[PDB]
Enzyme design. Sequence first.
Site, short mmCIF file in Angstrom:
data_model
loop_
_atom_site.label_atom_id
_atom_site.label_comp_id
_atom_site.label_asym_id
_atom_site.label_seq_id
_atom_site.Cartn_x
_atom_site.Cartn_y
_atom_site.Cartn_z
N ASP A 1 -30.48 -6.08 -4.24
CA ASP A 1 -29.67 -5.68 -5.43
C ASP A 1 -29.82 -4.22 -5.76
O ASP A 1 -28.80 -3.62 -6.19
CB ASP A 1 -30.09 -6.54 -6.59
CG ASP A 1 -29.58 -7.98 -6.49
OD1 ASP A 1 -28.84 -8.32 -5.53
OD2 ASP A 1 -29.93 -8.74 -7.44
N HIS B 1 -16.07 7.28 -10.62
CA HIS B 1 -17.25 7.69 -9.84
C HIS B 1 -17.51 9.17 -10.18
O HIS B 1 -16.59 10.01 -10.10
CB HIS B 1 -16.92 7.52 -8.34
CG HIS B 1 -18.13 7.48 -7.46
ND1 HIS B 1 -18.96 8.56 -7.25
CD2 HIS B 1 -18.60 6.45 -6.69
CE1 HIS B 1 -19.93 8.18 -6.38
NE2 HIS B 1 -19.71 6.92 -6.04
N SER C 1 -26.17 26.57 -17.76
CA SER C 1 -27.27 26.32 -16.82
C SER C 1 -27.05 25.06 -15.98
O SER C 1 -26.66 24.02 -16.50
CB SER C 1 -28.58 26.18 -17.59
OG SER C 1 -29.67 25.97 -16.69
N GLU D 1 0.85 -1.17 0.00
CA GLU D 1 0.00 0.00 0.00
C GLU D 1 0.89 1.23 0.00
O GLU D 1 0.53 2.25 -0.65
CB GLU D 1 -0.88 0.02 1.28
CG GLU D 1 -1.90 1.17 1.38
CD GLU D 1 -1.36 2.49 1.94
OE1 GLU D 1 -0.17 2.53 2.40
OE2 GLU D 1 -2.15 3.48 1.96
#
EC number: 3.4.17.21
Lengths: 696, 696
Positions: A612, A635, A574, A370
């Site tokens: 689900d 994301h 907008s 890591e």
Amino acid sequence: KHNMKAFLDELKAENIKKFLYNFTQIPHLAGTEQNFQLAKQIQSQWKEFGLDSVELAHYDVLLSYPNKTHPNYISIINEDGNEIFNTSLFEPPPPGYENVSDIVPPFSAFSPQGMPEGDLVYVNYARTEDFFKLERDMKINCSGKIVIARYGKVFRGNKVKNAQLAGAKGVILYSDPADYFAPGVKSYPDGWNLPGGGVQRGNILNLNGAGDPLTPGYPANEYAYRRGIAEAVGLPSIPVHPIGYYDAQKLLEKMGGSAPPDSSWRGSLKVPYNVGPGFTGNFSTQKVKMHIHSTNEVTRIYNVIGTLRGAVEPDRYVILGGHRDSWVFGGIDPQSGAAVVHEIVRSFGTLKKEGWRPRRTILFASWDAEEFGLLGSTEWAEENSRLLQERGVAYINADSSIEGNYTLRVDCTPLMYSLVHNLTKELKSPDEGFEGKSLYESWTKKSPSPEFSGMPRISKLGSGNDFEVFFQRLGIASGRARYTKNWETNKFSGYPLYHSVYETYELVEKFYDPMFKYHLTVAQVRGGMVFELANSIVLPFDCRDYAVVLRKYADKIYSISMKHPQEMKTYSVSFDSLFSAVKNFTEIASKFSERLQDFDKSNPIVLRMMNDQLMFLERAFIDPLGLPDRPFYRHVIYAPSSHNKYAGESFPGIYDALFDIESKVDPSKAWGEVKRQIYVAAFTVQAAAETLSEVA
Amino acid sequence: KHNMKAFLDELKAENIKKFLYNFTQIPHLAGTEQNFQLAKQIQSQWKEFGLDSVELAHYDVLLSYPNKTHPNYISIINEDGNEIFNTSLFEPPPPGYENVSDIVPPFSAFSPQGMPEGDLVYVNYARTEDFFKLERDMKINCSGKIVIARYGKVFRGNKVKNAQLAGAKGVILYSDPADYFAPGVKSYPDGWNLPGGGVQRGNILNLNGAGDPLTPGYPANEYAYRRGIAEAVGLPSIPVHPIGYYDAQKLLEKMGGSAPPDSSWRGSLKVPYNVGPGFTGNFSTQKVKMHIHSTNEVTRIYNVIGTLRGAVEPDRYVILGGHRDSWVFGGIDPQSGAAVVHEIVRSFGTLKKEGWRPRRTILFASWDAEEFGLLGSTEWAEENSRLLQERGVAYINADSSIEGNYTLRVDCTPLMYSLVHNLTKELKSPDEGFEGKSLYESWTKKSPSPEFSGMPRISKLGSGNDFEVFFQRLGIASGRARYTKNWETNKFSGYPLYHSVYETYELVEKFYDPMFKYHLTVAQVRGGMVFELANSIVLPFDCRDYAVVLRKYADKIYSISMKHPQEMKTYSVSFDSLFSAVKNFTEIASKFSERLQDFDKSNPIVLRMMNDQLMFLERAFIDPLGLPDRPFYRHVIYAPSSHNKYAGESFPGIYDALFDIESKVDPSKAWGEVKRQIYVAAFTVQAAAETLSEVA
Ligand SMILES: *[C@@H]1O[C@H](CO)[C@@H](O[C@@H]2O[C@H](CO)[C@@H](O[C@@H]3O[C@H](CO[C@H]4O[C@H](CO)[C@@H](O)[C@H](O)[C@@H]4O)[C@@H](O)[C@H](O[C@H]4O[C@H](CO)[C@@H](O)[C@H](O)[C@@H]4O)[C@@H]3O)[C@H](O)[C@H]2NC(C)=O)[C@H](O)[C@H]1NC(C)=O
Ligand SMILES: *[C@@H]1O[C@H](CO)[C@@H](O[C@@H]2O[C@H](CO)[C@@H](O[C@@H]3O[C@H](CO[C@H]4O[C@H](CO)[C@@H](O)[C@H](O)[C@@H]4O)[C@@H](O)[C@H](O[C@H]4O[C@H](CO)[C@@H](O)[C@H](O)[C@@H]4O)[C@@H]3O)[C@H](O)[C@H]2NC(C)=O)[C@H](O)[C@H]1NC(C)=O
Ligand SMILES: *[C@@H]1O[C@H](CO)[C@@H](O[C@@H]2O[C@H](CO)[C@@H](O[C@@H]3O[C@H](CO)[C@@H](O)[C@H](O)[C@@H]3O)[C@H](O)[C@H]2NC(C)=O)[C@H](O)[C@H]1NC(C)=O
Ligand SMILES: *[C@@H]1O[C@H](CO)[C@@H](O[C@@H]2O[C@H](CO)[C@@H](O[C@@H]3O[C@H](CO)[C@@H](O)[C@H](O)[C@@H]3O)[C@H](O)[C@H]2NC(C)=O)[C@H](O)[C@H]1NC(C)=O
Ligand SMILES: *[C@@H]1O[C@H](CO)[C@@H](O[C@@H]2O[C@H](CO)[C@@H](O)[C@H](O)[C@H]2NC(C)=O)[C@H](O)[C@H]1NC(C)=O
Ligand SMILES: *[C@@H]1O[C@H](CO)[C@@H](O[C@@H]2O[C@H](CO)[C@@H](O)[C@H](O)[C@H]2NC(C)=O)[C@H](O)[C@H]1NC(C)=O
Ligand SMILES: *[C@@H]1O[C@H](CO)[C@@H](O)[C@H](O)[C@H]1NC(C)=O
Ligand SMILES: *[C@@H]1O[C@H](CO)[C@@H](O)[C@H](O)[C@H]1NC(C)=O
Ligand SMILES: *[C@@H]1O[C@H](CO)[C@@H](O)[C@H](O)[C@H]1NC(C)=O
Ligand SMILES: *[C@@H]1O[C@H](CO)[C@@H](O)[C@H](O)[C@H]1NC(C)=O
Ligand SMILES: *[C@@H]1O[C@H](CO)[C@@H](O)[C@H](O)[C@H]1NC(C)=O
Ligand SMILES: *[C@@H]1O[C@H](CO)[C@@H](O)[C@H](O)[C@H]1NC(C)=O
Ligand SMILES: *[C@@H]1O[C@H](CO)[C@@H](O)[C@H](O)[C@H]1NC(C)=O
Ligand SMILES: *[C@@H]1O[C@H](CO)[C@@H](O)[C@H](O)[C@H]1NC(C)=O
Ligand SMILES: [Ca+2]
Ligand SMILES: [Ca+2]
Ligand SMILES: [Cl-]
Ligand SMILES: [Cl-]
Ligand SMILES: [Zn+2]
Ligand SMILES: [Zn+2]
Ligand SMILES: [Zn+2]
Ligand SMILES: [Zn+2]
């Protein structure tokens, strides 16, 4: 009975203490024999604890190490080329560890090699705004200069990227006492402060979620095809090295040129904090020279993966993962977390030996590498992406359990807010003055939400840890929790001994958590969240909490754009579509929540159909095309800040399109891209909302 | 009882005949009022038939139309600039349609405007190998030339791409009688052959799966941000126009320069098929001039989407989709398919009115704008990608039901081979000489598998129809079926009247299928597949059939590489990992199939857990990074040929890396990319295999 209470009661502070001691006697640097031995120990122990299977998953990834016989250092050199000052070759080892072998000396992992020689420019924290101040306001040019930057405020990889882009030919990172020395506290070993010879290790990559530099998108397995070095992802192009504040004072004290622009540029050392370039009159012919000889090497790493098979939904995974590799002893980072995971596994295993199984499968992970860029978690996720994207319920990280001892910190998806509130109301506070009160009570009192009365603060997930691939690449609901400092009173960055040799078992036992009560509380929070996620009939996610935050984020991004009203008029910019999408999500989420509470509770198909929908809700915010030039940040609502990997940014596509937009040479193109990002965000929000509509 | 037999028996040839007549009286060109009126009619009728909901889903997409008052044509011009021959302005309309309004004249949709004038080079079918023959062998340079190419062999968009890349400044497409005139058959209206004034319409885009040119990746909804024209996906850069063989003979007859290289370059016209450039001695000062004035226009399109909600798994979708827009009357393409869909909906609706529902949801789609680049199916898939990727069981296409009347054609995923074999064994053959025999028997006799005795041919899916987004972008198991020609004896391309004004109801009723028996058989195949997919307890997919084909494809790609043994030695190019992955898939698939037949049949969770493994198996072949420079072709095993959109290619990443590799200037880089593609394929195969392993 076998319920959450039985699980929580079995967790013992004394066991976490024993495991931390066991994990911190020798270094466990990624890619070394010692860390492979620890992996095999944890594998054996998880099997003994009662897990169904425990395997090693190995990968061959690019790591970085100093050269043992050609050490890294920085010099001041006179005009004759004599080196008249040299930085340290190592941190003075702590008491009783002065004979410990294989302590890696301080270095910046993945620095290229080189011996650049030049004049010093001081760049404060080397943030984007520090470089703007230098170039635009002070008219100081970093091209061909060595820059010296204090650690703190942002991830060190962003500092390096910024200095590169400024034209620096090298970077010196140092820990200023302003950021790493708390007033009134002694230096290690007599307190928890950083001494002047202490140094913060750490990687300086800019991977943007890619994992191993050589194999972006695919696991670094036995037959992997590797990119050449020149095509690798995220490597710095200029030499970089970290030093302590005794050495930094020697480099800064002779600095001349321009005065610091203001007090926010001054640390705590007895130096002027002059920006430069170069040294004052008398020392003007002297220069700074770096000597970096570190090498990048493909090296084998090992994740331990333990499985506790589910009784009813064995094809639904709840993952508890944290890393095992450390820079040196890892007394806090990561072994304070790994000891907590170990005790969690032991407690679940005790229930399993008595005939219990969780409803869903629980996976336990001890990640490797890591510290070198989230390499073990990301390579395993790349190998198993299909299983994770169709079966992954949630990921709970488990790095350091403490960064202070004042109160709880939680960062997670809004889908877990209600879970966390409810769980902490049932746990005992470990805090002095809160005896017999809930953890929820002490946390809310000490760390109030900036938005809501009688609610605690929960932050967005940023990055810089092993949840990044699960959350921002794969869209699996994710969270983390630990004990933290008092944010009001403590102005320092993280904890002072972060990634230093001084981060030991003794640091924790003497100064952070002598009774291991905070570690136990963190084990109850992380373990309890895993328990609820893996055993609750209906998944414990509340979609309405996402609705509330989406509106907050929409208001925020709109407010940023509204600093440019003339351009919004000219280019017809907008936010109506985004607010419309958020309104729709709010309405659809409400109706879904009604169904969830009113559905025929005898029907497992309506239940899993609704489970689900709950599971794939986080998944719906994924855009398979990723964000601009960051294909592994997929994301749409949350990405790591382009300016600071540690910080989360909301609506990152729109945020980055708006950032410093007034400096763009082609406003029509720049505002067109803002409008494109609005479209992508509004569409993704509405598409996510529609996953919660009736299915047919 | 309500079973498959009840469904199949309710289908009537006479109804399909009535619907075809109803759908083919006026043109239904995408974006026109007539096609919106037909959409509203189909919506109303599907509601009357008994569906649960029937909605229009509209999008505003880039379409292309000729200018009504500035017609497209090609001239021969003399050296004074006089136009001494002009191609036709329209096809002579068929008997009794000579007064029909709004027949779009022949054009190549999405051609840019222009009036290029130059010398003609004849390029055969304008395939990659035709251009290789011209440039490399004959040393003929197409730069600044107008190329004339015969239709056939490959998708017309690939011809246009190839001519562009060759430096052509314009392309003339024509139908040669060699490819569009079957020996011994009369021209329409007296037979089914193409007359000399007949012309094939069709788009010339190279979208590579993107959908609307202006909005790649996102639906073209009300707030969509559009790319400018210059950034649009897949538009041709040079003018293009199609003509019939009477006009082609006038353009070809004066051609001079080089002789055709061999007989494979000669069509059936009484001309020499000289390659050029330019005309023979006497006519050498004459030139060819195109006049193209078509315009691209963002235009609204409408999909009809009908839902029949499932009784037990309403969150599992089985989709039957085909398009509704036509070039002119659409007598075969698409209305012979749309009439079959209409009768299928009616039959399911009859069962529903009697109290039946299928186990899974069935969605029925009438797509718009397929003829302009699969635009309606792809925009709807982009809008609903999250629902489709998590809930989509299967997609069954339903364009033209007939391209001949000899035997069955099926192209589909290996996951549907067993389904198709089993279903056709229970259906009656409609063929003369096979009275009282199964469809399986007549199909297998007439179209034997090239691999296996006593099995019928099933092809790979290629592209050029509305399954492309579902299969190659989203990884949903897909199939198609229709009646076809005798492949041994009929050397022509498709059917002769393809995309001509002559493609009418009368063509079908008089010459293809007077009794509508082949249409009925195709309705039983498509409807029966939808029935089994939507009602079978265990999904009717056999993973072992994928194993068999993967080995065939691995042998094939290895054989291609093995034409270069010296380079495989030099660059250490091994297929060992791919064969290993295929071996593993074979083993894992076998063990899965055992579990599937031995699992506790009372347990719905083990069942749906195993149904999800079946559903997500096609999904596991998706690579989210897509293929090189084709980000919407994400399936690793199957993509449309880079040389011919209509053809499927297996292991396309490796195939394209190997293609013409001996001509690459840097062999080390080119073979490195072959090795990269081997890695990506072997990893994807193994990852797909591991989705079928025990889940925990
Ligand atoms: C939040 O959720 C609401 C629904 O509660 C969504 O509302 C939709 O909003 C869009 C606008 O973005 C509406 O689109 C309009 O559709 C009209 C036709 O709608 C009818 O027919 C369709 C089938 O085609 C049905 O689906 C629908 O139920 C209606 O029966 C079009 O005629 C409109 O176009 C005309 O006006 C526009 C604007 O001036 C012009 O640009 C056009 O050229 C044209 O003249 C328009 O396209 C849609 O009807 C709404 N659906 C509803 C109410 O069910 C929001 O879009 C959603 N928010 C987000 C971000 O998705
Ligand atoms: C088809 O399916 C089979 C399994 O049935 C897969 O077999 C694996 O193949 C890989 C090689 O690609 C093997 O990898 C080797 O692993 C050794 C250690 O394995 C043990 O420990 C691991 C945990 O780390 C366990 O998972 C495993 O069960 C064993 O207990 C390594 O030591 C090997 O590395 C050494 O040799 C190589 C080759 O000479 C050197 O390059 C190295 O430097 C090193 O010296 C090697 O990595 C793996 O063990 C196999 N798994 C099994 C048998 O369960 C196939 O890979 C699969 N096909 C595809 C395409 O995926
Ligand atoms: C966190 O705890 C809160 C407080 O207990 C949970 O909310 C509560 O959830 C229960 C069970 O779903 C709700 O009961 C339901 O009430 C409705 C009508 O009020 C009734 O029709 C149902 O049959 C059911 O009894 C209760 O209303 C609700 N209370 C609230 C929201 O104040 C919450 O779900 C927990 N969060 C999790 C588990 O993530
Ligand atoms: C296509 O039809 C074939 C032929 O009927 C189907 O294969 C058959 O499927 C049945 C039901 O699963 C198999 O029966 C099973 O046999 C095993 C042991 O032989 C037994 O343990 C089970 O309880 C069950 O009775 C049968 O063996 C099998 N026959 C074969 C393969 O020859 C096939 O599944 C159909 N394809 C589909 C539905 O896609
Ligand atoms: C950490 O704890 C482990 C487990 O108790 C210790 O490893 C054991 O050591 C004994 C004596 O060397 C062996 O007989 C066992 O086989 C070991 N078990 C395993 C699972 O490895 C280890 O010695 C401890 N480490 C430290 C620094 O105390
Ligand atoms: C195709 O069939 C439809 C349905 O029967 C016909 O549309 C109907 O026409 C009648 C008379 O104009 C109306 O009263 C109905 O309201 C219509 N129904 C619908 C659903 O549109 C249509 O006329 C037929 N077209 C052709 C060319 O025959
Ligand atoms: C490390 O330094 C030594 C001593 O000068 C040298 O021989 C060796 O090549 C270096 N190791 C590397 C580059 O891995
Ligand atoms: C710094 O290190 C170099 C390399 O060993 C040496 O030449 C020099 O004398 C050292 N300088 C000081 C001040 O110790
Ligand atoms: C900074 O430094 C170099 C000169 O060495 C030059 O190329 C660059 O344009 C300079 N930029 C300024 C002064 O803004
Ligand atoms: C831990 O808590 C004690 C007592 O409240 C305090 O003195 C100490 O400073 C804290 N330690 C750290 C490292 O914050
Ligand atoms: C079509 O041609 C006419 C007549 O010359 C012209 O006025 C008009 O602009 C054209 N239409 C377009 C470009 O849409
Ligand atoms: C071809 O069309 C043009 C444009 O109307 C006209 O000038 C020319 O005379 C026509 N040529 C013939 C041979 O009809
Ligand atoms: C083809 O045509 C042009 C000359 O007009 C030239 O640029 C190109 O290189 C030529 N290629 C050949 C002869 O291969
Ligand atoms: C249809 O079948 C008949 C009788 O077998 C045959 O004469 C005819 O050519 C076929 N039509 C087509 C278009 O293939
Ligand atoms: Ca990788
Ligand atoms: Ca689109
Ligand atoms: Cl953490
Ligand atoms: Cl079809
Ligand atoms: Zn850590
Ligand atoms: Zn760390
Ligand atoms: Zn069609
Ligand atoms: Zn067509």
